[PDB]
Structure 1
């Protein structure tokens, strides 16, 4: 198992997190100003919230993979000596989620003198970066180094060889593209919008902004920077393997992801300008959201998971062999990976007015939950079918 101090730290951090969350809710109901816009803060903190949520669901995944015998230490090609058990991710999640609640609380109370209240997001997202690139061999240096060496083979896409960890993380970034949007919004807001002279700044004097629009191609390019990576990765895998079916057909789906965003952006620009030929684009976009919400779905079931098989037997649209104990799980996941998959690319085109933002903030933790369920059966099908194509035996 794990030492008795690691479980103590897990519990301590989760308790502090719970109490600080309740205090956050109460202070937001009572101590709030209710006179200035709160969105320039909601986005900046929504990024980090999605990160913390993702780091806890990934701790639950590493427990489900071990209880069911998936052997994720050979698939990732990890080291069978030292690995992060679920209690080592439940611990980083809580630690980084304590500072998030502390920053969000200080941005409400501002319980200090002349120091401005816009330095708290900078402090939080500076500490979150310096926790990762600490050169001193402490606080999980082996894991952070294994992750830093690998976040470098992903962003420089076509110059390396694609292993399962590169593919897994590059596909994990597809459902985590809100972090990039909110990391771009922080920069464009701190650069040319927030007035440093005023002592409040983060909640500006209003109740009209220039960085959350689909602007001159810089919100759309960051929106699908996580599809460009996997497009090039599949093209490289085709260039190397020469098996033209799976890799080319696969890249043809991120290709569709490319068209939806550009057509939505074109329509948005044309109407915010007020051109007469705007509506012709709105008919095209709808075709790409219907085309690409299906392409990525009939691929999750038939090829990623491998469920709708012909020689199933008694399993009624599942595989011949299943690993997870029960059998209702495979049907709840099937019914969920269509409901949550339709809404996922609404939120990619949609990222319209202030009613078009309480939808993005609500659906953002539902694209990091759909990936949490993807990770469960992708790894299982990779274990007993080797369908990724990445292992000789």
Structure 2
């Protein structure tokens, strides 16, 4: 309400402290009004002296904040012109190089980068202009409010004697700067095409939140409703219309991956909504284009659509109304549709989003030959917690290639055959390597980062933490195969195994609480066990995260060990399936604090 929430919505995520503290002056004026001693206990001289002293303190605070505004604006303007001169020099160099093939491609990439730089400079200039306008509006509003409450005209005199003569308000150099940038872009860059110049230099109202179209919200609601009703009917159909002829392992073992993917997309949508609400400049961190970024609603829509596809495919797998090929087409059809959706080459269905995502995925998969950005290793750590999809895909390809009789029906082939359990076994080695692929990719990425930076800490320690999983999985496999062979010394390999269990968790957990989040700092001060500046209002969120992460790390390591070792022949698959949709929740809660730590400590 009023200018208060307007300013609060128009806060720049970077310079939040530099803005006028409308709330502070608001509450201190109400504090002035609230005291109000008894009407007849003392002379009106005391009341007027109280009014005068509080007015003097109000003027002192206003002058202090005004001086801070002047200094901040002058400094900002200083680097504004210095950056303008630097970009003008670069533009002149590029133009004179062009005026006088590989050279043409270099000029093309340079001018495109220059256009992007001019775009961000124009955003900076308009941000400064909005800064000045918001400060002026806040000053006029607070002075009017004060003149109203104190029923005096002193606020107007203070404003006219201070504000309209303030250097920040009197300086119009920002307008000449933006006009010169616009003219340069129109003339030198666009060759007189003013329309294209503006179209590239548009600035959508980022300050006014985001005008989400009603159609997107309606579609999200429709998809959510259809998904929940399909889920309910799936539960009822599974409970009632299922008979007993086979233990239904393959169906869950195949659809667990789709369930994990859908849950991950939903949680990432919640994650980005919280990121936007908290004020963390995530778009800058991911070097995304500020013109076009995906809000949470699109992620919710995509998650709902994939959930619909998965649920209908699984329900068709149960019921199987009528066909010629009985049941082993639905999972294949669903996965084919998903993979084709991901690689759609037309300019439809978020073409830029899919292109950028697949480019990032190719970069992260070929990481040993690429640099390290924040969008790269974050996706690598995202994939590190989703080894279950790779496991399920390998199991599905094994089942459909070797075990399943392709030209047959039903799909409950006898388990008494020797070929039953070919990849329910582990001596093939096709389980340890698949599980360790994410760890290997992440570790080699960290090693390349260290080599590029030439700085041992913290990259070597990080590489060790990523490499502990190698020992974990390999020794679990050794124990499993030696138990299969029934050797006398096999039990010995159990002992140190448990040791390497602990040296994993208590290790990585520490890495999760010192460098990833920067908590437990020596300068906690008033906030025991926490950090000085926390964006989220409540510390109970931090407490629940710190109490859940310790359990979830043990859960993840034990679940990956049992998945790759396949002991406990009955309950092993059940424990793996039940523990799978918990590490994803851990990965969801981890991102909040990871980025709120990175945003403050840029580093």
Bin for the TM-score computed over the shorter chain: over 0.9
Give me the whole-angstrom Cα distance separating, in 2, the residues matched to 1:317 and 1:283.
Answer: 35
Give me the whole-angstrom Cα distance separating, in 2, the residues matched to 1:246 and 1:134.
Answer: 40
Alignment of 1:321 onto 2:321 = no
Say which of 400, 416, 421 aligns to 1:190.
400
Let me know the Cα RMSD of the aligned residues. Answer: 1.4
Give me the whole-angstrom Cα distance separating, in 2, the residues matched to 1:373 and 1:286.
Answer: 28
Give me the whole-angstrom Cα distance separating, in 2, the residues matched to 1:134 and 1:200.
Answer: 34
Aligned-partner SS, 2:515: helix
Greater mean alpha carbon deviation, residues 300-309 or residues 198-207: 198-207
Aligned-partner SS, 2:525: coil
Q: 1:204 deviation in Å?
A: 6.0
Give me the whole-angstrom Cα distance separating, in 2, the residues matched to 1:268 and 1:367.
Answer: 24
Answer whether contact 1:118 1:202 (CA < 8 A) is retained.
Answer: no
- CA deviations over 1:52-101 (Å, ceiling 9, x no partner): 00000000000110111111101111110111100000000000010100
- What are structure 2's unaligned runs of at least 5 residues? 1-210, 563-567
Aligned CA distance change for structure 1 residues 122 and 204 (closer, same or farther; 3 Å): farther
Q: 1:205 deviation in Å?
A: 7.0
For 1:384, the equivalent position in structure 2 comes to: 600
Answer whether contact 1:175 1:371 (CA < 8 A) is retained.
Answer: yes
Q: 1:196 deviation in Å?
A: 2.1
Answer whether contact 1:37 1:204 (CA < 8 A) is retained.
Answer: no
Aligned CA distance change for structure 1 residues 205 and 17 (closer, same or farther; 3 Å): farther
Give me the whole-angstrom Cα distance separating, in 1, the residues matched to 2:352 and 2:414.
Answer: 43
What TM-score do the two structures reach when normalised by structure 1? 0.96
Aligned-partner SS, 1:225: helix
- What are structure 1's unaligned runs of at least 5 residues? 388-393
Aligned-partner SS, 1:131: helix
- CA deviations over 1:241-296 (Å, ceiling 9, x no partner): 01111111100101111100000011001112222221111112211111111111
Q: 1:239 deviation in Å?
A: 0.3
- CA deviations over 1:149-192 (Å, ceiling 9, x no partner): 01001111210011001110000111111011001111111010
Q: 1:132 deviation in Å?
A: 0.6
Answer whether contact 1:307 1:319 (CA < 8 A) is retained.
Answer: yes
**Structure having the larger proportion of residues in helix:** 2
Give me the whole-angstrom Cα distance separating, in 2, the residues matched to 1:14 and 1:171.
Answer: 29
Which has the bigger relative contact order, CA under 8 A and spacing at least 6?
1
Answer whether contact 1:36 1:203 (CA < 8 A) is retained.
Answer: no
Give me the whole-angstrom Cα distance separating, in 2, the residues matched to 1:310 and 1:98.
Answer: 50
Aligned CA distance change for structure 1 residues 376 and 280 (closer, same or farther; 3 Å): same
Q: 1:116 deviation in Å?
A: 2.3
Q: 1:197 deviation in Å?
A: 3.1
Aligned CA distance change for structure 1 residues 59 and 206 (closer, same or farther; 3 Å): farther
Aligned-partner SS, 1:333: helix
Give me the whole-angstrom Cα distance separating, in 2, the residues matched to 1:104 and 1:196.
Answer: 20
Give me the whole-angstrom Cα distance separating, in 2, the residues matched to 1:277 and 1:156.
Answer: 41
Answer whether contact 2:479 2:490 (CA < 8 A) is retained.
Answer: yes
Q: 1:356 deviation in Å?
A: 1.0
Aligned-partner SS, 1:111: coil
For 2:334, the equivalent position in structure 1 comes to: 124
Q: 1:212 deviation in Å?
A: 3.3
Q: 1:203 deviation in Å?
A: 7.3
Answer whether contact 1:36 1:204 (CA < 8 A) is retained.
Answer: no
Give me the whole-angstrom Cα distance separating, in 2, the residues matched to 1:35 and 1:69.
Answer: 55
Instruction: Give the number of equivalent residue pairs.
Output: 386
Aligned CA distance change for structure 1 residues 212 and 77 (closer, same or farther; 3 Å): farther
Answer whether contact 2:517 2:597 (CA < 8 A) is retained.
Answer: yes
Answer whether contact 1:263 1:284 (CA < 8 A) is retained.
Answer: no
